[PDB]
Every structure is written in structure tokens, then in C-alpha cells.
């Protein structure tokens, strides 16, 4: 919950921040806004190599901008 | 003489600990523009020995001040001088056993600051969403239950939304993973600095002539060129902030745009130079400020008997999760009581915009019974059940179906 | 409760709930401490209530016993200590 | 103001 | 050090403990350069002890934390 | 349902006064009571008020003032 | 074998511990707004942002 406290402290200079963090989850139902979601990069999706080229598909498909990614490397304990 | 000329910031609290203090001290002074501002505590109870070790460090002895008193009585407000204060924070301490008791006191302090100083901006923190509307007059509210349970729900859909937001809200220059040997460690350190910033369309190095073009047409051209992701827009007509407007939003000449980068334009210009469901609103909103998202719902609201797995009802008599035959893997939620956070869990997971065949069923492993308040609120939603058990008891878990389950949320106290 | 004036918060929150719900409803109460008259039927976005706090300070400075006097919930007869 | 300030105090 | 922390008020800097002691010492030394007969005049540069004393306090508390280090200053203050 | 999408404009662009009225109105349908009583019977007044004790004879009398009388025993 | 004995007590199919729950212990981490030149590995999950109809 340390992050929820840090949100409040940083929001002093960044007033907008509270509304962003609330909208990211999907609590404030502002008509024009959207929501956060996932898309798994399967064996078929390696068509595209890099993160920059990935925009050409996702932006031109259906208004889908990406924020970041979630990798899975091999390291078995 | 200090209060007239020099700056002034306040912090009210139930009982100040090291974790509330240290994290505030690090994050507040991390802001480069806001370094010289003075800090003042307004704690009712006596000092710990650990908190004295932090205050007595040379630099924090100068700026950080401790007033031992409560926000209700006016002498503690008169010594601090709230009327000419820059900001005022009020933290609900994760300290008292009863959560509503700690919250009612925090709301009572919020009025005391509002009644004393009218123009002083409140940065209130609140536990329960039930008593959120009592401090909706304040500028910035942080319902910690809503935010906790909503992230835990959204973690089920997209893996690590918790950490995704943690790095956005945390202040950081991004100097991490430099001495670290591995590839992922150094690249993960670059992402620490990434925080959301704001700029207007006029003074825009990035979006100088992408006005007539579409929304994503600007971001792709910008990101390949410089390396900035466009997020949100609010024109001067209304302050309603957006997140990924569609292509129909045309980029105006004076809109306060929002974007993610390590730092803003003004701080560093290094890179600058070189089956029979229903879609509808949830009727039983359990609290006042519950913005109702469009959601999947049952056509007829199923009774209290059909919600509980443990006993076979007089509609479809089944006991364990295997007898129902749930397609798609399961999600579980352990909890102390059936609070309104578990309603805030269900909302983002059971939305209309989520695909109906991707709806992973929900189980609420409550320790106590569910109240008639919450049972009526949760009543409407599809494929959500409960069983009275704990995480320690193995047999109670296996009935719910650990054998096939993607995620398992845990919330204890 | 450890502190004095925070002990009767439950009642103030429950009444302030009922005040927002039913503006029509005249609602009377006995709150324990006389400091918490201000919080009884509290007005957030109204300058006239917030102006009286500054007037209430000058009462206490002059050496007046009846300080709580000027709060609207008291004089209306919907609360007393 | 700019150059010496980052080396003196900060 | 004035141009770094020039926070509106100049009287926050000039009339202080660390600053006045310096101006009592260093201003005569600049007068001894311009005036040729004032080399033989008495200048209280022995007061630099109280400045070196104050120079230690800011230096030492840069980094028990200040048990032995504080007591060493309390000896310096007396001596 | 082509037109029910507009319900969000009604929900978003709304006051807490409406939120609280519609909360209570849903509780009345649960209990099985007439829903008219929130707005019609309870008309919302927020007028100022205060007391006076033994004023001068010259002091005036406004409309809807309540006077503290003292009766006697038969 | 502890869990497998609990499944016989409850009266459930015992196959689900080993077969359905295949045991994976792979490393994982997150990235936020990386460079355009950065690569895309197999089985990565990308945080998209959709829009309202």
C-alpha cells in the first residue's frame, strides 16, 4: 500500500495524477476514456520483431496504443 | 516570521510510524522544484524511539517539525498556522483494528482543517468507500480499499498491473541497474524513471505539427522519432481527463496533453537536440460515490442460496466447484469480511468491455459470513460464488478448486 | 479512545450522513463535548459557515464563555452539549 | 547560480 | 554562498553568527591592502577560532551518529 | 439496445443530490413502499434560524416565528 | 501425496494435481514504455489501452 501513499504525495505537484490512476483501473467511467488490457504475443505474433514496429499493427488495427510489456525468461530454481 | 515568508506544509495522522514517515520524507523531497519546503507533523499520541532517530539526522532536524496534538482542538492548529499553509495531508493510519473507527476520526479531522482554513487544499486519504462522500468536497481523495481491490482484480486480466502503476506513481530519475551485470536488470532500471507528465499543445517540442492528424497517428510518429507515449487529453471546455481516445479525437491547438517519459521536456533536453447474460448497470450501488461501470449481469438476479457453494440449494443442488463444471480456469479471493472492496474487485473484472467467454469465474473465500448489505450488492453479477473458509485450512480450499485456478487473491489483517 | 474530542466521531458522521440524505429532516442530538458543534451539520462548500469560525476566534480572544453560541446547529436548537 | 550551485550545496 | 541561497531576504544571510564573525575579520584585511599605513594596526584574527568552530559543526554532521563526534566539537568550542 | 448507451451521460453528468435520492428510492422498492415520499412529502428547505430571549418591546415580529409561551395549571 | 489423499477424502478426480497443474518456475518481470528498437520475445504480454464505442 506504500504505492497508494506515494500516489497521494506525488499528486501535490501533479493534480491530474489522481484522476489518471483512478481511470487506469476503470473506476471513474468517463465516456471518452478507455481501459487497460492485455494481448499475449504468441508464436504467430513474432511476425513483428521490435517494439517500434508493433505500433504499426496495433495503432492501425483498432485504436490500441501500448504502454509497456511483460517478459518471461527461463531461470528455474 | 517564518510562516509569513518561508513555505509551510502539514501532515495530520492517527499514530505516526516509520513506514508512513520515511516513505513520505523520501518521496516529497525527491521533487527537485519542491525541496526547500518545511514539513510539520500533527500527531496526537506520544513519540516512538525509532521516529526520534529519523528527526535527529542533521538535515531533517532543520526542516521536519513535530507538534504533539490533535486537529480537533484549535491550539494545535494555531501553533501550526493552517490559514497560510501551502498544502495539508491527512493519512488514515493502517493501525487501528476497526477500520470504520479509524476512518470516522480521519473524516472529522478533514472538517477541522476545512473549517479553520477555507482555501487550504486538502490531500485527504480515506480507508472505506462507504464514507468517501463525506470528503468529496476535498480536491484529492485516495480510497485505499478501492485502489487495493481494483488492482488485484485487474492483475487477473493483465498479469502485473500492480507494478505498472507503482513505477508511474513513484518519483525517480531512473539511475538504477547501472552496476548490475544482467541484461533485464539494467533495462528494468530504465523503466523505473518512467512517470506520467503533462504539457500543453502550444509549447510542444514533440507534437508541434500533428494537430489535423488523428490521435494514434501522432503517438506512432512521435514515439519512433523521440520516444514518448501519448496517453490523455482534456480541452479547456471541461476537465474530464481521457485515457486513449479513439481516432475520432482531433488534436486541438490548446489541450493539456498527458504522456509517459523518464522526464519532461523542460528538465532535460538531451534527446531533444540529437448462455444468457445481460449487459447493463449494477443496480445495488453499496456506497454513494460508486460510479457504475457497464457490466455483465444475470437477467434474473439469482437468490442467496445459489450464490453459496457449500450447501446444495433448492434450484441446482451442487456442493463443490467440480459439480458445476466451470469452463475457463478459476479466480479465488480470500478476505476477512464481505466489505465494499470486494464489490470494487468485481466491477473491473465483470465489465461489458471484457469478452464473455474470457470471464474467469470468481470465488470469495470469506472468513466471516457475508452481510445482507453485501449479498444484495453482489447478487446481480454472474458466475461469482462464496464459501466460508481460510487459507490455512486445506480442505476448504480444495472444494473451491485450487486444482484448477489461475489466481488466488489474499487480504488479511 | 486515547484523545478527547475524537471520542464522539461516530455520532457526527452518522448524523452528517442523515443530513446529506434528508435536508428537509430537522435532526436533534446531544454530542458529548462542546468543541464539536461546528462539525454537527457541517457545510463544506458554504463561505458563511467558514466565516463564523473567524468570528468564533475573536469571541475566545476577548474572554467569552459562550463561544460555541454562534454555530448554526446550536442556535437552531438541533444540538447541545 | 547554475554551474557552481550543483557542486557547492547539492 | 550568498548567491546560492539568495532567498529574497539578504538580512537572513548578512546579520548572522557565521557571517558577522567573518566580516569583523576579513573587512580589515581588505582595508590593509588599500591603505598603506594600516599593516601595523591590530586586527582580531584570533576570532577565526569561533569561525573554525562553526565550520566544523556543518562539516562533521554531513554524514553513534553524533555522540563522539558532537563531544569532540564541545571540546573544540571550549579550547 | 442501441440507445441505452446514453445512460452513462446521465450517470456521469450528475450531482450527489441525485445519487442520494436515487439510493433511497431503490431502498423503498426493496421494502415495498410508495416512492413518492422522498421528493413530494419531504420538500427540501435549508433556511437559517436562531433564538432570542426576552427582547425589547419595540422589537418586530417576522412571519413563521415561534414564541416560547408559559401556560398555567387548571 | 498429501494433497492426493485429501482428493480421495473429498471424492474428486486425483489426476488434477500433476496433469492439469504442470509445474513451471520461470522468471518474469515488467517493462514500461521501452525504446522502439527493443525486441519482442515469445509469450510476452503487452499492456494495451482500448477505447469506448
CB crowding B268-294: b at 16 or more within 10 Å, else e? eeeeeeeeeeeebbbebbbbbbbbbbb
Question: Cα separation of E66 and C42, whole Å?
Answer: 49
Q: How far is CA A63 from each of CA C76, E23, F8, F63, rounded to the nearest angstrom?
A: 58, 68, 21, 64
Chain A: residue nearest F8 by CA?
Answer: A31
Closest CA to E9 of B1, B35, D5: B1
B15: Cα within 13 Å, side-chain hemisphere: 11
CB contact under 8 A, G50 and A34: yes
Rounded distance between C-alpha atoms, residue B194 and residue B199, angstroms: 16
B43/B40 Cα distance (integer angstroms): 10
For residues B155 and C63, the answer to whether their CB atoms sit within 8 Å is no
Cell numbers standing for residue B59 = 538535515
Strand order in B195-200's β-sheet? B195-200, B256-261, B229-232
**Gap between the Cα atoms of F23 and F38, Å rounded:** 11
Closest-CA distance of chain E to residue B27, Å: 21
Instruction: Decide: B191 and G3 in contact? Cβ < 8 Å.
Output: no
B311 annotated as a binding-site residue: yes
Burial of B302 (0-12, 13-18, 19+ CB in 10 A): middle
What are the grid coordinates assigned to F14, written together? 450528475
Contact B151, B134 (CB under 8 A): no
d(CA A65, CA G46): 10
Contacts of E73 (CB under 8 A, 6+ apart): E53, E56, E57, E60
Name the helix (H) or strand (E) containing E28.
helix E17-34
Reduced to 3 DSSP states, what percent helix, strand and coil does chain A have, rounded to the nearest 5? 40, 20, 40
Backbone phi and psi for residue B227, each to the nearest 5 degrees, phi listed first: 115, 60
Residue C75 buriedness (CB in 10 A; 0-12 / 13-18 / 19+): middle
Contact G36/A at CB under 8 A: yes
For F7, counting Cβ atoms within 10 Å of its Cβ (0-12 exposed, 13-18 middle, 19+ buried), the class is middle
Burial of B236: CB neighbours in 10 Å, binned 0-12, 13-18, 19+:
exposed
Q: What whole-number distance in Å separates Cα of residue B355 and Cα of residue B328?
A: 12
Nearest to E1 by CA among E76, E53, E55: E55
What torsion, rounded to 10 degrees, do the Cα atoms E37, E38, E39, E44 define? 170
Residues facing residue A69 across a β-bridge: G31, G46
Residue B12 belongs to what H/E stretch?
Answer: strand B9-13
- Residue carrying C-alpha cell 491530474: A16
Q: How would you classify the pairing of strands A65-71 and G44-49?
A: antiparallel
B315-318: long-range contacts at Cβ-Cβ below 8 A with a sequence spacing of 24 or more? none
* Secondary structure of B237-271 as H, E, C letters: CCCCCCCCCCCCCCCCCCEEEEEEECCCCCCCCHH
For residue B232, is it left (φ>0), alpha (ψ between -120 and 50) or beta?
Answer: beta
Backbone φ and ψ of G29, nearest 5°: -165, 170
Give the distance, in angstroms, between the CA of residue A61 and the centroid of all CA atoms in the same chain. Answer: 17
Which residues on chain B are in Cβ contact (under 8 Å) with G51? Answer: 244-246
Q: Does the CB of A67 have a partner CB in chain G at under 8 Å?
A: yes
Across the interface, of B160, B184, B247, the residue whose CB is closest to A73 is B184
Q: Distance (Å, rounded) from C-alpha B226 to C-alpha B152?
A: 34
Residue B254, CA distances (Å) to A20, B26, B214, B234, B345 in order: 20, 35, 16, 9, 37
**Residue B262 · residue B194 · CB < 8 Å:** yes
CB of F50 within 8 A of CB of C76? yes
Q: What are phi and psi of B143, to 5 degrees?
A: -75, 105
Backbone φ and ψ of G46, nearest 5°? -105, 130
**How many of the other CB atoms lie within 10 Å of CB of F28?**
14
CB contact at 8 A, B399 and B387: yes
The alpha-carbon gap from E77 to the nearest alpha carbon of chain B, in Å, equals 19
What is each CA distance from A43 to A46, A66, E55, G21, in whole angstroms? 6, 19, 67, 23
C-alpha cell at B35: 525541496
Task: Count the neighbouring beta carbons within 10 Å of the beta carbon of residue B386.
Answer: 24
Residues 6+ apart with CB under 8 A from B90: B11, B12, B13, B71, B106, B109, B110, B113, B122, B123, B124, B125
CB–CB of E18/E50 below 8 Å? Answer: no
Angstrom distance (rounded) from CA B207 to CA B224: 13
Task: Tell me the structure's resolution in angstroms, rounded to a single decimal.
Answer: 3.8
Q: Given an 8 Å threshold on Cβ–Cβ distance, is F45 in contact with C23?
A: yes
Reading the block at residue G24, the C-alpha cell is 513451471
Distance CA B39, CA E53 (A): 29
Locate cell 573544540: which residue?
E76
Find residue B200's DSSP bridge partners.
B256
Residues of chain F positioned with their CB less than 8 A from the CB of C23: 44-46
Is B316 annotated as contributing to ligand binding?
yes
Q: Residue B161 is placed in which grid cell?
A: 498491473
| Residue listed under C-alpha cell 486538502 | B122
Q: Which three cell numbers stand for residue B202?
A: 502550444
Q: What are the beta bridge partners of residue B197?
A: B259
Cα dihedral B223, B198, A39, G26 sign: positive
Determine the Cα–Cα distance for residues B151 and E52; give it in Å rounded to an integer: 57
- Helix B18-29 to helix A2-10 angle, to the nearest 10 degrees? 40
Cα–chain center distance at B34:
24
> Which residue from B30, B400, B70, B73 is spatially nearest to B192, judged by alpha carbons?
B30
Q: Which residues pair with B12 in a beta bridge?
A: B42, B90
Query: With 0-12 CB in 10 A as exposed, 13-18 as middle and 19+ as buried, what is B144?
Result: buried
The burial class, CB within 10 Å (0-12 / 13-18 / 19+), for E11 is exposed
> CB-CB: which of C20, C22, C75 is closest to F42?
C22
- Please answer whether residues B151 and A7 qualify as being in contact, where contact means their C-beta atoms are separated by less than 8 angstroms: no
B207 assigned ligand-binding residue: no
DSSP string, B108-162: HHHHHHHHH-SSSPEEEEES-STTSGGGSSSSEEEEHHHHHHHHHHHHHHSTTHH
B315 is in an annotated binding site: yes
Q: Is the dihedral of CA B392, B395, B396, B399 positive or negative?
A: positive
CB B258 within 8 A of CB B275: no
Give residues with Cβ within 8 angstroms of B122, minimum separation 6: B88, B90, B110, B113, B114, B135, B138, B139, B140
Q: How many CA atoms lie within 13 A of E49 on its CB side?
A: 8
Which cell numbers in the block locate residue A55?
505500433
Q: Please, are residues G51 and A35 in contact by the beta-carbon 8 Å criterion?
A: no
Residue F33 sits at the vertex; the CA angle it makes with F27 and F38, to the nearest 5 degrees, is: 65
Q: How far apart are CA C78 and CA F47, in angstroms?
A: 14
Question: What is the rounded CA–CA span in Å between residue E58 and residue E47?
Answer: 18
Q: Do E9 and B58 touch (CB under 8 A)?
A: no
Chain-chain contact of B399 with G16 (C-beta, under 8 angstroms): no
Which A-chain residues 33-62 have CB contacts (< 8 A) with chain F?
none
Q: Could you give the CA distance from residue B44 to residue B40 in angstroms, rounded to a whole number? A: 13
Q: Are chains C and D touching, using the cut-off of 8 Å on CB pairs and a minimum of 3 such pairs?
A: no
SS3 B348: helix
| B:E CB pairs within 8 Å | 9
Task: Evaluate whether A23 touches B243 at the Cβ level (below 8 Å).
Answer: yes
What does residue B26 show for φ and ψ, rounded to 5 degrees? -70, -50
- The CA distance from E13 to E1, in Å, is 9
Please state how this structure was obtained: cryo-EM
Cβ neighbours for C74, distance < 8 A, ≥ 6 positions apart: C37, C40, C68, C80
* Residue F18 sits at the chain B interface (C-beta within 8 Å): no
Q: Which of C47, F20, A6 is nearest to B91 (CA)?
A: A6
- Residue closest to B193 by CA, chosen among B178, B203, B205: B178
Minimal CA–CA distance to B82: which of C8, E25, C54, E77? C54
**What is the dihedral sign for C-alpha B114, A3, G52, B191?**
positive
Q: How far is the CA of B135 from the CAs of A3, B69, B154, C42, in angstroms? A: 21, 22, 26, 11
Give the largest Cα separation in chain E, rounded: 53
Q: Output the DSSP codes for B387-405.
A: ----SS-HHHHHHH-SSSE
Q: Cα separation of B39 and B37, whole Å?
A: 7
**Phi, psi angle pair for A12, to nearest 5°:** -55, -60
Which distant-in-sequence residues (6+ apart) come within 8 Å of E46 by Cβ? none
On whether B95 is known to bind a ligand per the annotation, the reply is: no
Q: Is B259 exposed, middle or buried (0-12, 13-18, 19+ CB in 10 A)?
A: buried
Q: F25: part of which helix (H) or strand (E)?
A: helix F16-31
Dihedral over Cα of B170, B171, B173, B178: its sign: negative
Find cell 489423499 and name the residue: G5
CA A63 to chain centre: 14
Q: How many angstroms separate the CA atoms of F69 and B220, rounded?
A: 80
**Inter-chain CB proximity A29 and F8 less than 8 Å:** yes
**Cα torsion through G40, G45, G46, G52, rounded to 10:** 150
Amino acid at each position: 500500500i506504500s504505492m497508494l501513499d506515494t500516489l497521494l504525495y506525488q499528486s501535490f505537484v501533479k493534480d491530474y495524477m489522481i484522476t489518471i490512476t483512478r481511470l487506469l483501473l476503470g473506476l471513474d467511467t468517463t465516456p471518452g476514456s478507455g481501459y487497460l488490457c492485455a494481448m499475449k504475443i504468441t508464436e504467430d505474433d513474432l511476425w513483428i520483431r521490435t517494439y517500434g514496429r508493433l505500433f504499426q499493427k496495433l495503432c492501425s488495427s483498432s485504436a490500441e496504443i501500448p504502454i509497456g510489456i511483460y517478459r518471461t525468461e527461463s531461470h528455474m530454481f | 516570521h517564518r510562516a509569513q515568508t518561508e513555505k509551510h506544509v502539514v501532515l495530520c495522522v492517527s499514530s505516526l510510524k516509520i513506514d508512513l514517515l520515511m516513505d513520505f520524507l523520501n518521496e516529497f523531497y525527491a521533487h527537485p522544484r519542491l525541496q526547500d519546503y518545511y514539513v510539520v507533523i500533527l500527531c496526537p499520541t506520544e513519540m516512538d524511539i525509532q521516529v526520534r532517530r529519523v528527526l535527529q539526522i542533521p538535515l531533517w532536524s532543520q526542516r521536519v517539525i513535530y507538534l504533539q496534538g490533535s486537529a480537533l482542538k484549535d491550539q494545535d492548529l494555531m501553533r501550526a498556522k493552517m490559514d497560510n499553509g501551502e498544502a495539508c495531508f491527512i493519512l488514515s493510519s493502517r493501525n487501528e483494528v476497526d477500520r470504520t473507527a479509524a476512518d470516522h476520526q480521519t473524516i472529522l479531522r478533514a472538517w477541522a482543517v476545512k473549517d479553520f482554513a477555507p482555501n487550504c487544499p486538502l490531500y485527504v486519504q480515506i480507508l472505506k468507500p462507504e464514507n468517501k462522500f463525506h470528503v468529496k468536497f476535498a480536491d484529492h481523495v485516495v480510497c485505499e480499499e478501492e485502489c487495493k481491490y481494483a488492482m488485484l482484480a485487474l492483475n487477473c486480466v493483465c498479469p502485473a498491473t500492480s507494478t505498472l502503476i507503482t513505477l508511474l506513481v513513484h518519483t525517480s530519475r531512473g539511475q538504477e541497474g547501472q552496476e548490475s551485470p544482467e541484461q533485464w536488470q539494467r533495462m528494468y532500471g530504465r523503466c523505473s524513471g518512467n512517470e506520467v507528465y503533462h504539457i500543453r499543445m502550444g509549447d510542444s517540442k514533440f507534437f508541434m505539427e500533428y494537430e489535423g492528424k488523428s490521435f494514434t497517428y501522432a503517438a506512432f510518429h512521435a514515439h519512433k522519432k523521440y520516444g514518448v507515449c501519448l496517453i490523455g487529453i482534456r480541452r479547456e471546455e471541461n476537465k474530464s481527463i481521457l485515457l486513449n481516445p479513439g481516432p475520432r479525437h482531433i488534436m486541438a491547438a490548446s489541450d493539456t496533453c498527458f504522456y509517459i517519459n523518464i522526464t519532461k521536456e523542460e528538465n532535460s533536453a538531451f534527446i531533444f537536440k540529437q448462455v444468457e447474460y445481460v449487459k447493463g448497470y449494477p443496480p445495488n450501488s453499496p456506497y454513494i460515490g460508486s460510479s457504475p461501470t457497464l457490466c455483465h449481469l444475470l437477467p434474473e438476479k439469482a437468490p442467496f442460496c445459489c450464490l453459496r457453494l457449500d450447501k446444495g440449494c433448492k434450484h441446482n443442488s451442487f456442493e463443490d466447484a467440480k459439480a458445476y463444471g466451470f469452463k475457463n480456469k478459476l479466480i479465488i479471493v480470500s478476505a476477512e469480511t464481505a466489505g465494499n472492496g470486494l464489490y470494487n474487485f468485481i466491477v473491473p473484472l465483470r465489465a461489458y468491455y471484457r469478452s464473455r467467454k474470457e470471464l474467469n469465474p470468481i470465488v470469495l473465500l470469506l472468513d466471516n459470513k457475508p452481510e445482507h448489505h453485501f449479498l444484495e450488492a453482489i447478487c446481480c453479477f454472474p458466475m461469482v460464488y462464496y464459501m466460508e473458509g481460510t487459507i490455512d485450512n486445506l480442505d476448504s480450499l480444495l472444494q473451491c478448486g485450487i486444482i484448477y485456478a489461475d489466481n488466488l487473491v489474499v487480504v488479511d489483517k | 479512545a486515547e484523545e478527547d474530542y475524537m471520542a464522539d466521531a461516530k455520532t457526527i458522521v452518522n448524523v452528517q450522513t442523515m443530513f446529506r440524505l434528508f435536508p428537509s429532516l430537522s435532526i436533534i442530538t446531544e454530542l458529548t463535548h462542546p468543541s464539536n458543534m461546528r462539525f454537527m451539520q457541517f457545510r463544506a462548500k458554504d463561505s458563511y459557515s467558514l466565516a463564523l469560525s473567524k468570528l468564533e476566534k475573536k469571541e475566545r480572544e476577548n474572554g467569552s464563555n459562550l463561544a460555541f453560541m454562534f454555530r448554526l446547529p446550536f442556535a437552531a436548537g438541533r444540538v447541545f452539549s | 547560480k547554475e554551474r557552481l550551485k550543483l557542486f557547492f550545496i547539492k | 554562498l550568498i548567491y546560492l541561497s539568495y532567498k529574497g531576504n539578504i538580512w537572513e544571510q548578512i546579520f548572522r553568527i557565521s557571517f558577522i564573525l567573518e566580516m569583523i575579520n576579513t573587512v580589515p584585511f581588505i582595508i590593509t591592502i588599500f591603505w598603506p599605513p594600516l599593516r601595523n594596526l591590530f586586527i582580531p584574527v584570533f576570532l577565526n577560532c569561533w569561525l573554525a568552530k562553526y565550520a566544523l559543526e556543518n562539516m562533521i554532521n554531513d554524514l553513534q551518529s553524533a555522540m563522539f563526534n558532537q563531544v569532540l566539537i564541545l571540546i573544540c568550542t571550549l579550547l | 439496445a442501441e440507445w441505452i448507451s446514453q445512460q452513462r451521460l446521465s450517470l456521469y453528468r450528475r450531482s450527489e443530490r441525485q445519487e442520494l435520492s436515487e439510493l433511497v428510492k431503490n431502498r423503498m422498492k426493496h421494502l415495498g413502499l410508495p416512492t413518492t415520499g422522498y421528493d413530494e412529502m419531504n420538500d427540501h428547505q435549508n433556511t437559517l434560524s436562531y433564538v432570542l430571549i426576552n427582547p425589547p418591546p419595540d422589537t418586530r415580529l417576522e412571519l413563521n416565528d415561534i414564541v416560547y409561551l408559559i401556560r398555567s395549571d387548571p
